């Protein structure tokens with residue numbers, strides 16, 4: 001699709017069998033999702049946002065559907081205002097910015 | 100242009116007579132620029148994301164050139180670690196997400 005930006009670019013994602021809402025976020029390198037159970041091990045990651053740096057859980061090679069497109073990659077889990085899909089997964093679904 | 104998301108979507112902007120580098124950010128409601136002086140009245144605002152909140156000054160009816168395109172709108176100014184062009188100005192230059 002072509003998504004205009006008059007409203008928040010919210011899409012439906014599917015991860016761990018659960019449907020959630022997430023924001024398509026070109027301003028984030030990484031993908032951050034609110035607390036949930038994911039399979040396998042995690043490793044520590046520090047990420048920086050507008051308020052500063054926080055610690056999150058990094059799960060690699062997670063299967064996640066994003067607006068109907070399958071991606072498999074790194075998902076960070078931690079305290080976020082909204083689930084955010086970052087460039088690591090936007091590139092997998094073939095997303096570009098155009099004007 | 101069509102901007103790939105392999106790297107950060109950074110562009111050159113001109114605001115208040117100054118050239119700056121800024122992130123094209125679909126995940127941001129508003130535009131927020133590292134602290135600088137702007138003309139006219141302002142009011143305080145709190146904005147929050149990863150790492151919590153920061154206090155900023157809200158200036159309305161500010162003209163910015165974004166990669167050569169003039170747009171006008173609200174600009175927030177404060178201690179952001181990165182210059183952010185948010186949806187309120189991305190819409191004005193006709194920016195869309197496509198996949």
Ligand SMILES: CC(C)CN(C[C@@H](O)[C@H](Cc1ccccc1)NC(=O)O[C@H]1CCOC1)S(=O)(=O)c1ccc(N)cc1
Nearest residue numbers: 027028029030047048049050126127129146147148149
């Ligand atoms: C958290 C989202 C929902 C909203 N933000 C935009 C996001 O793109 C934000 C932009 C940014 C990048 C680097 C440093 C600081 C900020 N990226 C971000 O945090 O990257 C983290 C998460 C994964 O990778 C690292 S915001 O800055 O908090 C914000 C809030 C309100 C307004 N009016 C404007 C901006």
